[PDB]
Ligand binder design. Structure first.
Ligand code: BCL
Ligand code: BCL
Ligand code: BCL
Ligand code: BCL
Ligand code: BCL
Ligand code: BPH
Ligand code: BPH
Ligand code: MQ8
Ligand code: UQ8
Ligand code: CRT
Ligand code: FE
Ligand code: SR
Ligand code: SR
Ligand code: SR
Ligand code: SR
Ligand code: SR
Ligand code: SR
Ligand code: SR
Ligand code: SR
Lengths: 318, 60, 258, 280, 40, 60, 60, 60, 40, 60, 40, 40, 60
């Protein structure tokens, strides 16, 4: 038996914290805090305050506009029947301009809402980018997040804007809908001859698997050395303790090498940014450079051959 | 073919409770293993039905 | 001639660029990995008197300096750390053999009981007030509505015996939470810290179980050079002792099972 | 060889099994009784994957035989064999390599366990590892069993196993609609998000702008509270990430456990229960 | 390894008796197996 | 002097109880293995129909 | 090898316990390996019908 | 060269033990490897039917 | 490295001869293997 | 020119103990690499059927 | 390498004849193999 | 760095001929290789 | 060579070590990139059959 540090079993409150203080120029903070005994059951119970500048307001603004075009459009596709909207919601979506239009700005009823929602969404994501760089500067900190967000933004941009512009057709960006965007994904692999044989998509998959591997390992570690205040990673990084020691040693004795309280955060950091960056590269070469990845894999001798036990005659060849 | 038996001494070196449950566990698992091996082979008793296969008691 | 298929496509060379950036990345990460624990301990080093400092591939990165806030100091990595004797003796003289703790295992400060020498100063709030302090030093703190107040529960060790009673609750002034339980020990009424990580509650009974050590061991809990605050040195020291009990506190945790 | 602070912890005992028999180190790896069982399982496993590569699907001289890394592949027996042991050169080999893989992962897990007992740390890691071991087992033991034949397991080959995933995925037409698949995918993506956020944070505070000192807990909470009005806090973020990644593995295991044994139709069709509620 | 040279004659004596007992049991099973079903 | 006259001495290097346990474990594992191996070839004794076929003793 | 009479001195260099376990494991797995490889070729000694047919000692 | 050395000084540079174990591990590996390489080619010596074909030496 | 120059004398003898015994049973088994079934 | 005034002292800048190991590993790896590369093209020296084809041309 | 000038003569002494032993068995196996079944 | 000026003379000397011993084995093998199997 | 004259003061602002390494990297990289650009265009010089085709030095 032993506490697992899964659920804070006994909590404590103190007057809320408005936070470390920001320099002149960085506007006031808004909202005044509250505590959720239940968030508290598992984490900091404090909820907010939040910061909102020109940036933050222009981003929340654009973002909600974009959310409205997508939604309103979805209600329109079901005739303003909020019931039907509720019924098929998962299947509802706002499709992209048709190819007939190329990269021209299309009519409202033929895709223009998508281009506007795509436009406003992008501006709002990139404004949130700027937001995190400002919020990160007010604290003297570094832009590590911003270099990652910038990577995920990279993938996003490659998906809905960069590849489309390169391919000369807004119909190639992804449509806003749950099931619609799932279908876009499958069709994407199909159209280019099975994306499994795309090296970049294999790497992105090794890196997604790796984010789960590393965070599960590290996270389990920090809990296993939580007993020695290993969660307090900052001081174990400046002033190594037996938590960071037992931590580095568990792995050392297990897989033969190890890292440090500071470096594991770099392996993890670099592994996540890598997912999105192989991922985006992966979508970049599809249609722009390679049109049929399976064939590509055959040309580079990577696709396995199996005894042909089942086969079909080609009517196109009769 | 030597002379000392007295192989009771075995429990002065080996913890009895843990040996007990160990044999217990192994016996239930070996049991399941063996059951799955014969039931997947010819000496099968289930995929037969005595004296007549029962879903071929009615064809309809 | 308008068909000379090139065998090299952008996809090959992008896979080439990637692997090269990869190798440099891997190498680099392994360098940040040697900012502690290095160079290694062999008898390769001792046999040669030290002429073989063990570092492997890649090598060690130039030191980096951490500038602690609050007149705190400056730390470097990688650094040169003074060796420290091992409070144990080789189970075998052959290399790679484990060592047996010297004396009374919970006292040894070897094994699950070992720990390093962290500063003999305190971690500080942003403001600079002792981050971890008791609720008696941190006036504001308060149990969360609907949580048994630990204050007054009975602390009980691994064998059942009462150990002491909760005399107070230590809290983080930086990230508000219970870090340490205080224990007025029965056998001598001395006050000791008990890490939250070692403590289980039995709210319906107001007990606070501790599998770590036996009720009795609570007598030897490493002590604080001040009952109203604690240093980094002292935290490791407190916890590692309890941890030792995980392998020591009984003549059975030593393993085997069979 | 040891870390510059390692000797002081390299205690004797803590085993589950072996006791002083295998209670020693080799380089930095801990051996232990399970390191030996593990190494044996592992070595035979790999050495057999080498023999499978050596022989090929039609014999060592045929064109399908190969030593190319992308294409070497060891596949299960046909379904005709059910749960019986199939001849070696007909998927038997694949069965044995599997037994070795399961045994090696389980030994590895138990050896991490003895290592927790030695170092005196929580056993969160090997428990968490056991989730991957579980997923692997459903993909080779549970599903193919529930499915009356071992051949339902995936082949061991770098891309050929990708092909397994592909055609199995496609028997249900549009796998994306598998709801457990939707979960597991959600966790895998979010896990990848929190990790990038924690990673970024630790590195943003212990190394701040020049002219600034190592940052504080107060900063940490204040930044993510600044951005998104909330900060789960240091301990817990380590807790969440563990939750996300273990759950992601969970739902992968269940999403594949239900694809066959408990559902045969296309997956989009599953969502019918929703279009037919008596609300619409 | 907490043994004397004399407590390694004894364990060894009983061990040897038991192992040869096991191998014997094995040779028996191998004869029944060989009679009913020769494998060479 | 020859050998096999000081080979008891082996338990001065290898702890006797544990050596037993390891040996037993090996015996269990090797046992299941060999059984599976034999079952993996023609000398199989289960899916053989002995003395009368049982998979055709469930339809006639 | 070390074949120059002073080939005992090797054990001041290589630890007897560790070398022992290594030899043991390597030998056991090596044995299993070679066995399955041979069982996997024409030199098979099980799937031959030796010395009289066994699948015609039960089936058809 | 008819030159079995110059200076034996190498063990003042490279740990005698490390090179020892390394040679052993790597050689065992190279051995298994090359064995496998040869079994996969025409130079195969097991699936050759040496010295007379064995799967067609008896009933089948 | 646990042993003296004199104990590295002791270990070595038994080691060499038992390894030779193993090799004996193996070479023997191989000659046996060669009569019943030539492979080369 | 191209005459190297002093390629000694090169071992005063670069630790030799390291340098040898560097070379050895690098050469064994490069060795396997080139080996496999030649093995993967026309320049193959194994799958040639030398001096007489061994499968189905080799006595059997 | 914490060894003396005399035991790096010695280690070298026994080592070389040893490697030569390995090489001997090696050339043996290779010539025998070339005799029974030529590869080039 | 951790050598005297005399033992890097000594080291270099032994090193170069050792290296050339290697280059020799190689050009020899490549000569063999070139004779049985010319490539250009 | 600035070209006149107090543009040296620029190394009073940007670390010379950093600027140098930066440029080294940027160029070492750009070179590779444009090389690749040339490899995919009219200026390609390798897979051209220039000045005489080499896979038609025999067949393959
Ligand atoms: C068509 C191609 C030709 C070919 C032509 C050539 C040519 C040409 C060459 C070879 C060479 C090699 N060939 Mg050939 N080869 C072919 C067919 C084969 C076949 C086969 C299955 O048929 C085999 C097995 C080989 C095998 C080999 C190796 C024997 C050799 C390279 C040794 C090496 O890597 O140096 C490694 C270099 C070293 C310096 C390492 C020395 C060893 C040290 C001591 C490492 C041991 C480990 C160490 C002790 C670890 C130290 C401890 C650590 C420091 C901690 N060839 C075909 C026929 N082969 C090379 C050769 O002959 O040798 C000159 C060569 O130049
Ligand atoms: C359908 C069958 C195809 C398939 C087709 C594709 C396609 C197509 C793609 C992937 C993509 C990827 N695939 Mg896949 N994929 C296949 C099967 C798999 C399997 C598996 C076990 O079989 C796995 C593990 C994966 C794994 C993955 C991930 C590794 C990768 C994307 C990571 C990611 O989250 O990016 C997602 C993260 C982002 C997009 C950034 C998110 C940040 C944005 C900006 C957030 C903004 C938030 C917003 C503003 C909040 C407000 C909401 C508004 C309402 C919008 N695929 C098969 C072969 N896969 C990518 C890829 O590989 O391309 C080469 C991709 O685009
Ligand atoms: C084919 C087209 C279908 C589809 C078909 C399937 C099928 C079919 C499956 C998945 C599976 C999954 N898919 Mg999918 N999938 C689709 C598209 C996607 C997309 C996407 C963007 O489009 C994504 C993100 C995913 C992602 C996922 C995850 C939800 C899940 C895989 C994780 C897992 O298995 O954990 C499990 C992790 C493990 C089992 C590893 C365990 C580790 C073991 C114990 C040790 C390994 C040791 C080994 C020796 C390590 C090597 C080290 C060496 C020693 C050096 N799929 C497409 C549309 N997908 C798989 C799944 O559900 O998981 C069961 C599954 O069966
Ligand atoms: C690379 C492949 C394709 C695609 C591949 C997949 C696959 C495969 C899957 C998803 C799934 C989902 N995708 Mg996706 N997806 C694409 C790109 C996007 C983009 C975008 C603008 O780029 C967005 C917003 C999404 C959004 C979503 C999430 C809604 C969801 C899983 C949650 C998650 O990981 O959260 C991490 C992030 C957060 C927790 C941050 C906050 C979330 C915000 C507010 C979500 C906004 C939209 C929301 C759904 C609308 C109202 C709420 C509903 C009640 C749920 N995808 C890319 C182009 N996506 C998974 C699913 O099952 O659902 C369909 C799934 O199986
Ligand atoms: C047509 C091809 C021929 C063939 C051609 C060859 C050729 C040619 C060779 C071999 C050689 C080997 N072959 Mg063959 N071989 C064939 C078929 C087989 C088959 C089989 C199932 O059919 C098997 C099992 C083998 C097996 C082997 C190994 C016995 C041997 C090298 C082992 C090794 O690398 O160890 C690694 C080596 C070591 C680890 C060092 C030795 C061990 C210790 C150090 C010595 C004891 C030292 C002392 C006592 C100090 C104590 C130390 C302790 C032992 C630790 N061959 C086919 C038929 N084979 C090679 C050989 O003979 O090696 C000389 C060789 O040259
Ligand atoms: C390593 C790559 C991973 C990654 C990284 C990543 N994501 C990031 C970041 C980073 C580094 C950020 O910095 C940023 C962030 O903020 O992190 C928490 C972000 C982000 N990750 C998110 C999403 C996201 N990332 C994803 C994926 C990934 N991102 C990868 C896994 C996914 C997927 C595919 O599953 C999603 C869904 C967002 C929360 C955030 C970007 C948020 C953003 O850009 O905002 C844009 C606009 C809005 C949200 C509009 C505001 C709407 C408000 C929520 C409503 C509030 C209204 C209020 C009541 C006001 C009154 C209204 C009035 C108008 C009436
Ligand atoms: C469950 C949540 C996540 C997770 C967690 C996790 N994995 C873990 C751990 C944890 C906590 C460990 O502590 C343990 C570890 O050692 O950390 C790296 C482990 C581990 N994660 C690894 C693998 C792994 N985990 C994965 C994923 C996941 N693991 C999830 C993302 C994945 C994938 C598919 O994404 C892989 C590939 C291992 C490196 C390691 C355990 C290593 C180990 O067990 O070694 C012993 C066995 C061998 C050395 C090989 C045995 C020899 C075999 C007989 C041959 C191989 C057979 C195999 C079946 C063939 C498959 C071939 C493929 C090419 C298809
Ligand atoms: C004949 C015979 C005897 C055979 C010879 C035997 C042979 C061939 C010898 C060769 C021996 C050699 C070369 C190797 C042995 C190979 C072994 C057994 C296999 C390796 C298996 C293994 C698990 C390898 C996996 C490698 C990888 C990349 C794993 C993924 C995990 C990951 C991404 C790794 C890096 C990150 C790590 C290690 C993080 C751990 C880690 C985490 C997670 C923290 O949170 C933490 C917190 C505070 C301080 C430290 C840490 C810390 O170290
Ligand atoms: C210094 O450290 C740090 C902090 O501390 C200061 C931070 O605050 C921060 C900021 C971090 C944040 C603000 C965290 C924000 C969290 C995010 C973005 C994650 C998003 C997650 C969600 C929205 C929740 C989704 C899940 C649910 C709603 C509940 C789902 C429930 C389900 C599916 C049913 C439950 C059952 C199962 C899942 C099956 C069984 C489960 C398992 C087997 C898993 C096991 C888990 C454990 C934990 C042992 C960072 C980055 C940091 O690094
Ligand atoms: C009733 O409802 C009320 C509240 C009104 C509102 C409800 C709204 C709701 C519920 C909306 C729900 C929306 C959902 C669920 C949306 C889901 C979207 C998903 C899952 C999308 C997935 C992928 C989409 C992608 C990747 C889109 C990419 C698009 C891009 C990158 C577009 C870029 C366009 C740009 C930058 C435009 C440029 C314009 C220029 C300047 C070039 O024009 C000249
Ligand atoms: Fe962390
Ligand atoms: Sr039956
Ligand atoms: Sr019936
Ligand atoms: Sr071949
Ligand atoms: Sr209806
Ligand atoms: Sr039979
Ligand atoms: Sr042949
Ligand atoms: Sr035969
Ligand atoms: Sr050519």
């Amino acid at each position: 038996p032993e506490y697992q540090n899964i659920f804070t079993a006994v909590q404590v409150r103190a007057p809320a914290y408005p936070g470390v203080p920001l320099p002149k120029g960085n506007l006031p903070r808004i909202g005044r805090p509250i505590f959720s005994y239940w968030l508290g059951k598992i984490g900091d119970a404090q909820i907010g305050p939040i910061y909102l500048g020109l940036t933050g307001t222009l981003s929340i603004f654009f973002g909600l506009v974009a959310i409205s075009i997508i939604g309103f459009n979805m209600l329109a596709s079901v005739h303003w029947d909020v019931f039907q909207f509720l019924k098929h919601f998962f299947w509802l979506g706002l499709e992209p301009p048709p190819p007939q239009y190329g990269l021209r700005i299309p009519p409202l009823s033929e895709g223009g809402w998508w281009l506007m929602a795509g436009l406003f969404l992008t501006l709002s994501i990139l404004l949130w980018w700027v937001r995190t760089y400002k919020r990160a500067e007010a604290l003297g900190m570094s832009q590590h997040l911003s270099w990652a967000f910038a990577a995920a933004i990279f993938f996003y941009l490659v998906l809905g804007f960069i590849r489309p512009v390169m391919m000369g057709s807004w119909a190639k960006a992804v449509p806003f809908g749950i099931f619609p965007h799932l279908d876009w994904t499958a069709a994407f692999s199909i159209r280019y001859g099975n994306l499994y044989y795309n090296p970049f998509h294999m790497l992105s998959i090794a890196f997604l698997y790796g984010s789960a591997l590393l965070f599960a390992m590290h996270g389990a570690t920090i809990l296993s050395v939580s007993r020695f205040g290993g969660d307090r990673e900052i001081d174990q990084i400046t002033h190594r303790g037996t938590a960071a020691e037992r931590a580095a040693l568990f792995w050392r004795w297990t897989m033969g090498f190890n890292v440090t309280m500071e470096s594991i955060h770099r392996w993890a950091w670099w592994c996540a940014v890598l997912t999105v960056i192989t991922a985006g590269i992966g979508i970049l070469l599809s249609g722009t450079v390679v049109d049929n990845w399976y064939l590509w894999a055959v040309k580079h001798g990577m696709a396995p051959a199996y005894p042909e036990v089942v086969t079909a005659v080609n009517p196109y060849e009769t | 073919f030597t002379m000392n038996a007295n192989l009771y001494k075995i429990w002065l070196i080996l913890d009895p409770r843990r040996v007990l449950v160990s044999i217990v566990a192994f016996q239930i698992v070996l049991g399941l293993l063996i059951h799955m091996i014969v039931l997947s082979t010819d000496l099968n008793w289930l995929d037969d039905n005595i004296p007549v296969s029962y879903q071929a008691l009615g064809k309809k | 001639s308008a068909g000379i298929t090139h065998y090299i496509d952008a996809a090959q060379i992008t896979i080439w660029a990637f692997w090269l950036f990869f190798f440099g990345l891997i190498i680099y990460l392994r360098r940040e990995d040697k900012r502690e624990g290095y160079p290694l301990d062999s008898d390769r080093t001792e046999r040669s008197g030290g002429r073989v400092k063990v570092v492997g591939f890649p090598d060690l990165p130039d030191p980096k300096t951490f500038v602690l806030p609050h007149n705190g100091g400056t730390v470097v990595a990688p650094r040169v750390e003074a060796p420290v004797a091992v409070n144990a003796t080789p189970f075998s003289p052959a290399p790679g053999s484990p060592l047996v703790p010297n004396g009374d295992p919970m006292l040894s400060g070897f094994g699950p009981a070992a720990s390093p020498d962290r500063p003999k100063h305190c971690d500080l709030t942003f403001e600079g007030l002792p981050k971890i302090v008791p609720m008696r030093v941190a006036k504001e703190f308060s149990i969360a509505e609907g949580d048994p107040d630990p204050r007054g529960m009975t602390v009980v060790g691994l064998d059942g015996e009462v150990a002491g009673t909760v005399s107070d609750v230590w809290v983080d002034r930086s990230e508000p939470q219970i870090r340490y339980l205080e224990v007025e020990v029965a056998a001598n009424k001395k006050k000791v810290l008990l890490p939250i990580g070692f403590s289980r509650f039995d709210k319906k009974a107001r007990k606070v179980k501790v599998d770590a050590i036996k009720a009795a061991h609570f007598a030897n809990v490493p002590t604080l050079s001040n009952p109203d605050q604690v240093t980094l040195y002292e935290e490791d020291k407190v916890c590692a002792y309890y941890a030792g009990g995980k392998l020591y506190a009984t003549a059975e945790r030593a393993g085997p099972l069979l | 060889a040891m870390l510059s602070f390692e000797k002081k912890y390299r205690v004797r005992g803590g085993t589950l099994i072996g006791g002083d028999l295998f209670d020693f180190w080799v380089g930095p790896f801990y051996v232990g009784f399970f390191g030996v069982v593990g190494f044996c399982f592992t070595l035979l496993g790999v050495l057999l994957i080498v023999w499978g590569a050596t022989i090929g699907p039609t014999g060592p001289t045929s064109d399908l035989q190969t030593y190319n890394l992308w294409r070497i592949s060891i596949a299960p027996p046909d379904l005709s064999y059910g749960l019986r042991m199939a001849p070696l050169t007909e998927g038997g080999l694949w069965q044995i390599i599997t037994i070795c893989a399961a045994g090696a992962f389980i030994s590895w897990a138990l050896r991490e366990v003895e290592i927790c007992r030695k170092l005196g740390i929580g056993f969160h890691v090997p428990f968490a590892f056991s989730f991957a071991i579980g997923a692997y087992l459903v993909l080779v033991f549970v599903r193919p069993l529930l499915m009356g034949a071992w051949g339902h397991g995936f082949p061991y080959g770098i891309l050929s196993h990708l092909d397994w995933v592909s055609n199995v995925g496609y028997q249900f037409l549009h796998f994306h609609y598998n709801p457990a698949h939707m979960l597991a995918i959600s966790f895998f993506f979010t896990n990848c998000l929190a990790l990038s956020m924690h990673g970024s944070l630790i590195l943003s505070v212990t190394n701040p702008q020049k002219g600034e000192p190592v940052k504080t807990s107060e900063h940490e909470n204040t930044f993510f509270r600044d951005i998104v009005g909330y900060s789960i806090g240091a301990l817990a973020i380590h807790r969440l990430g563990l939750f996300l990644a273990l759950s992601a593995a969970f739902w992968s295991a269940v999403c594949i456990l239900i694809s066959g044994p408990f559902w045969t139709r296309g997956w989009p069709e599953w969502w019918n229960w929703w279009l037919e509620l008596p609300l619409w | 390894t907490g043994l004397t040279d004399d407590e390694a004659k004894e364990f060894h004596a009983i061990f040897m008796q038991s192992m040869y007992a096991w191998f014997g049991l094995v040779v028996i099973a191998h004869l029944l197996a060989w009679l009913y079903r020769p494998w060479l």
